[model samples]
Structures are given as C-alpha cells and as structure tokens.
Target: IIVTPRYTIIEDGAINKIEEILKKLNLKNPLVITGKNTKKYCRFFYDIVYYDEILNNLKKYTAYDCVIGIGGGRSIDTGKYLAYKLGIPFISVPTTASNDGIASPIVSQPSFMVDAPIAIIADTEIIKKSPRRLLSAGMGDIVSNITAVLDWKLAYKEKGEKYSESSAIFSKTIAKELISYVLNSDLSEYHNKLVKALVGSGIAIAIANSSRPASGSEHLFSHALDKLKEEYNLNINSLHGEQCGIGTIMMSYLHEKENKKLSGLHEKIKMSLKKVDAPTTAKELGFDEDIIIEALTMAHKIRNRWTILRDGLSREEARKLAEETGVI
Candidate 1:
C-alpha cells in the first residue's frame, strides 16, 4: 500500500513552515513550480519556475532534490508530472482550494493514477481567502463521492471487481460531512471543512491505489466533456469540479431511476450542489445542449469503469437522462 503525504501541514502560515518540512523530509534544492497569480500572491518564492499549464518537453527540464508545486491545478500537476519523471518526492503546497488535486495521488494533466505527494502543505489563512467560486468548486469536487461510491459498490457486486471497504467508508463519510456543511454553513469554517474533506478524498484514493473510490460515471462524464470540448473546440471554461458536479447530478438521477433503493438522492445532490452555487445545469457550465448531449452519450467509452453507465446509452437516451436530471 502507498503511504501518502507522509508530511502534512494545514494551518495558518503553513507556507512559512515549508523550509522545515522539506528539511524533515530530507529534501533540498527543491524547485518551486508556480504560475502567474500564484507568483504574484507569493511575491516571488524560491527557484520561481513558471511554465504554461500543459508544459511538456520533459527533456529540457533539469532536476532538483524535490518538486514543490505551490499553486493551483496547473502548477501542482506540473510539479506532480515532473517529480514522476525524476522519480523523486513531490510536495504539494496548494494556494487555492479549487479541486481535490491538492492531495490526490493522480496527476490531472496526464491523468495518471499513481502516488500522492510525499508532502502536502496548505496555508488555510491563504487558501480560505481564495475566490468563493473556487470554494464552490472545491465543494463540487468532493460531492462526486456520493455517486462514485454508489458506482464502486455496483461494479463490485455486478462484476466481482475488487473493492476496498475502508476507502469507500472515507469517501462516503467525507461527502456526507461536506453535505452537512452544505446544509449549515459557509465561509472560513466551510473552507476548512472542505479542505480537510478534500484531503480525505486524496487519502481515500491512495488507499484504493486507484481513482475508483473517488471517480466513477461522474468522472466519465467529466472526461467526455474534456474530449468533446477539444474535439468540437467548444468554449467550456468550467473547472473540473464544476463539470464533475454537474455530471454527478445527472449520474445520480440515472442511479435513482435504475435502482429505487437510491430514491431521493438525485434531488439531495442537486440541492447540495446548488446550495454551494456550483453549476448544476448545462447553461451554468456554458455548454450548448448539443455538446452536453454528445458528452453524455459518449461518456461510457471515456474509461472502462462499470457503473450505471454500463453498455453505454444511445443519443436519445442520453438526452433524456440529461433532461430528466434538469441538467440540459
């Protein structure tokens, strides 16, 4: 099993603790992979390296004792990919609570499911102050746990797929707690709770050593959107969590319809997503009805995961599902 984020510092001024954290991890000469906003917020930090969101050209890169990804998705995954290439430790010091990638084992860019960072540092005083849109996105990001866990259990029962009990336990627990926060609160406490839940999601993935515990049909839909947006050159600027949150609403509707035992879940998830002001409809995500339908019909093939999306859906079926969920 993988021991993830052996070192974690999530508190006020957590950024200032990085030097000591790195020393404790026995890493030095670490390269800081940051971005424009993160750089400005940081007012310049060590070995400040900035690369475009999808920087490849691996051969041109040089090595450091460790890679410190100190920003949002772009820089964090950049460090994640680089550390994977160098076979060294990665430290994720996320400045934004936008997505679950802060402590996730997988790299979002290459979409590799692998080891989590050796260390994860989050300055709450810094993170909680980030945009409310990002906070909404973070909540959106973890809300998928509801549908993901359902899909995991369904796949295990339907096809004898190996499933981890503890991972699902964490995943479900985090989601439930997030929804509780959804029903009760917002602001600093909400962000703190959200960040911890997001970290727990990372732990859940690390325990499964797979994204299955944290991703399922909802993720497939998200991936479908990813491909369709590129194929059609669609202007879908929604964040990962935003897309997955919407997908979860649709997928939950499918699960509820297919299995009555899960009745009333779709509405709860939809409400929770809306409570946080996360995009629940195609319009909020800025996707035309045609592209949304295409993504749904093509979602099943995005990955080989078995969920409510088994055997795929026809174009009309996809459109109907989207309509029934009020996502179109």
Candidate 2:
C-alpha cells in the first residue's frame, strides 16, 4: 500500500493551527525531532537532535503518541525514520520549502518507509523568511525531475523496466509549472505554488511505488558526490538540489542525442538556474575537474538503475561532456 499524508496545509501562520491538528489526531505526546532553529514552532513532549545519535536514542521515544518533524530535511527525515521504527504516525512541519523531502517517504538514512506523515503544515511566512538560495535550491530540485523522468523512459525502453504514466505525467507537469514560475517578475509571488508542486512531486513518487518519477541519474550523480564527501573528508558544502541541477544539465546533454526537445528543455533549465542565482556548474559548486569526472564515471555504479551513464563514458568523454555543459 502506498502511504501518504492524510492532510496537508500551506498558508501563512499555519503553524498556529498545529496544536488543533494534533488534537484531531489524538496525539498529545509527540517526539519532535528538530534542530534549535525549529524548536520555537511547537511544544514537544520530547525533543531529539537530528543526527546519528538518534538511532541510539530511539527507544526513549517509543511511548510517544506520534513523531513530529519540524524543520528542514534533516529534522523531517530523522522524524520519519524514528516513526517508522516506533510504528507510529508522523507529522511533517517544514520550515522551508527547500526540498521535496518535506513530503517524501524517503529518509536520509538512505531508506524508504511506507509511513510518510499524517499531516504537513507549511507556514508560508516562515518559508518566505528563508534564504533566497534555499528557495532557488527547491526550484533546482523540482525542475531536475524533467531529466529524471527522461531517464526513467530510457530504462523502461531498454531494460523493460516498469513505468507509470500517471506518475510520470504528474511529476513532469509539476516540474514544468515550477519552471514556468521562473518567468514571473518575482519568484516569491508563487510561493504557495512551489509548496504544492513540491508536495505533488512526493505524491508522484508514492503513486509510482518507486522513486522513478522524481529521481534518476541526476540523483545518482548527487549520491556519488555525497559518497566522495565522506571518502575524501572533503569539507565542501552544497545543497542537494544544487548538485542535482548541475547533474541535470549534464544528463540533459547526454539525452540530447536521443530526444530533440530535451535539448531545448536543457537550455530552459540552465536559464532558470541562472535566473535564481543557483549554482549552474560543478565548478561553481567547488568541484574540480577530476572530481567531476570521477563522480560522472562512478555515479552509475552507485545504483543498479540504468542511466545514460551506464553506457560508460571514457574519462576524456566525461570531462568533455562536463566542459561542454560548463559544469566543470
């Protein structure tokens, strides 16, 4: 069965109604997995840090009525994992519309669970106060779904992988709508639309019974960069969507030989990123040529899912692709 939020609210001052919603859910005692930044939003029967230590401390909150994740991805993902462990429902209260994790069932433990959240209460005022860079990162994340769905089609055609037309169509539509918002004079004018788009993307994943609609080679590339961070102890800091945006550019270039309109879509994606002042190139993300090449070559190996990268690119070819896309 696909689990999704029972309710989602996006409006200014929505946080004010959280207590009422909690009562409706009959959740009096909640384990609020959050950071110091998000603690002001609620009164938690128990508050836990969002870190590796959460695993060791899980038992302490097993008795809570529910788990409420209040903050960004780190807090929300940790909460979802905790709720999954405790066999309780969860509530996602996103302080920023930085990523789709606000609604996705996927957690940072690199795992997926059936229980997403019972409710998602997004406060537009709070989200609007977030850094513009974070908003831009959200756009990058959503827009990358375009290339991600293309990769899904490639797998379905070549490997006989299953595809969901509804999921793919909805995911692509949300992404394109987000791109259309870029044409607005003020991106903030479409904050509610962005929030809904992010939520719809997560629902698309659930509808597909897989991440195919919202993730593909672009995600693999980001995951490879994440692995590189740990392996080399590099201190580089870049938002997940920022990396995915650059990955989308490279993947779009590769897909150009397959689909002509995808080439134009690539330019639109590039322009959107540039307009939002998001990191449009790998170099801008502080990745050197060698690291970019290694990520491209190794990203395909990180997951068994087939992508253009699976065809295997020579080091020179990978480097040339990155250069041509101005990603390195």
Candidate 3:
C-alpha cells in the first residue's frame, strides 16, 4: 500500500513557508496548478487554470522540479496528475477542507498513481474563509467513513474480501471522533480538529491501498444520485458530502438489523448532520421522495463492492426504510 510520506505539515501560516519547503526538498522552478481563489492569494512562478488546459498546451511551459496544487480538490487533482505524468514530486496545498482528497493517493484522472503528494500543506487561514456549508459538507464526508468501514468488514465476512483491521479501525475512530466533537459545537472553532480528522481519514485510505476505507455503499449511492441528475436533468442542488450523508443514514438503517450495535447509528448520524446545519433529508437536497427511492434502489448497481444494500431491497421497501429513517 502506498502511504503518505512522513513530511506532511499543517499550520496556520503554512502557505508562507512553501519556499522553505521547496528549498528543503531541493526542488526549484515549481509549476503550480491552481484555482482562481488560490491564485489570488498565493505566489507561484507559473500556473495554469486546469489540468486539461495544460495538457492541450503542454509545450507552453518548460520543465520543473515539482508541481504544486493549491486550491480545492480539482486543483489538487490537477497538480497531482501533472506531477505523475511528468515523473516529478507533487505537493498538495488545500485551501478548503472540503474533502479527504487532501492526502489520498486517488486522483480523478484516467491515469492512476499509487503515490500521494510528498507533502500536504493545509493552511487554516485560507480554509477559515471557505463557505460554512463546505466545512459541514466535509463533516458529512468524514462521518460517512463509519459506514464505509463497516461495509468493508461486511465484505470480508460475507464475500471473503480482503480487509485490514488496522486501517479500518483507524478510519472508524476518526469518523466517530469527528461527529462526536462537532455535535452542537461551533464548527469555526474546530478547524484544527477538522483538519486532523480529515487527514486521518485520507491516511486510512492510503494504508488500505484502496478507497474502500473511505468510500462504500454510501458513496455508491452518491454517485448514483449524480448520474441520475445528469440523466434526467434533475436540479438536485447538493454537494457530494450532503448526498453521502443521506446515503449513510439509509445504509446504516439497512445494516442495523443484523448488527444490533448499529441500532441507533442512523439517528446519531442524522443528529450530527443537523447539528452542523447540513442537509438531513432528500427534500433539503432539492429532491423529492420518489427520486430518493429510485437512487436507493439503483445505487448498489454502480459498484460491485458488497454492502448491506447488495441484497436488493424493493423500491417500496427502500422508500419505507428511507421514510422511517426520516431521510425522505
């Protein structure tokens, strides 16, 4: 498994120390892939807006010793792909704590790399200015790791799939602590805790060697909802984590019947989401009960990974479960 390097750094003024990091790594002439938000705030020798733009105009820029991605997830993935393609080191500087992509080995590009960035520089100053919705959405993503880890263990128990106890335990603990800490608390005051929890989940993914530790049936449902949105032109206005939060509630209900210990996990998740003002129902996400039911019925087909949803619930049953759990 490709884990993150031991040199990651997170501080209030981390961005101001980038030059020091570059010199320490013996890297010069770094190419930056950034977003408008980051470009307005950070200094970069040279930069491009998107990864595809750089690919189309590949020769416009000269060689560099490293690639720095400083923005949201899109910008980070852009720099990550470029560094992978160029066979150089990569650095991830997340301006927003919107997701665990800040430290994971996964990138959206077709060319996958087993390596994560050599360094992760998370500056709380920039992240503090991001939309509160984004931070709450991040908590949604972080809490969903609970169901994902359980789903991983279920796969191992039923399908004989490979499972790493150490990785799953680490991911589970972070998820639990994140939701517990944020409950009924001002999220702005917990920026450092949020950063720690986010990075912990990402490292769990790295140690697991796959996204299984951070994504599962909940994520599958989110992807299914996204596909349905594109297919039917549904104006389901919601962030990825918002949808995952709803999915987690539904999937947790499905898992609770077998594992009695998970009996109230759905309620715990729902309360945590509500505490942060995150969307707790399909209606808040701009979707109706019917669409929610459809997504629930079809979500498991999106991936072969076994979860509680693998045993197929009828549309009516799914709708009833969603309704009973207050997700619909």
- What lDDT tens digits, residue by residue, belong to model 1 across residues 1-328? 6758798777888888888888898877787888888875554346777857448545544557888888887888888888888777899998888888899988863377757999999889888888989989887779898889989998999988999888898898899988977887754488788888888898888888888778888988988888988888877688889989988998988889888998988888888888878889989989899888988888888877899889998999999988988998
Please, what are the lDDT tens digits per residue for candidate 3 over residues 1-328? 4657556777788888788888888887788888765677566555445555764654544567888888887788878887777878888889888788788877861224457788888888888878888887887788889899989999999899999999999999998988888775666576677777888887888777888888888988888888888889976568988889888888888888778987799899989888888898887888978878888888888877899887666899888998899986
Pick the lDDT winner. 1
- C-alpha lDDT score of every prediction, in listed order: 0.84, 0.82, 0.81
Q: What is the TM-score of each candidate against the true structure?
A: 0.94, 0.94, 0.93
Top candidate, metric TM-score: 1
**Model 3 TM-score relative to the real fold:** 0.93
lDDT rank, highest first?
1, 2, 3
Q: How would you encode candidate 2's per-residue C-alpha lDDT over 138-174 as one tens digit per residue?
A: 8778888988898888898899899987788899999
> What's the lDDT of the predicted structure labeled candidate 1?
0.84
Over 4 Å off, model 2: 43-59
Model 2: worst 10 consecutive residues (lDDT sum): 43-52
- Candidate 1 lands at a TM-score of 0.94
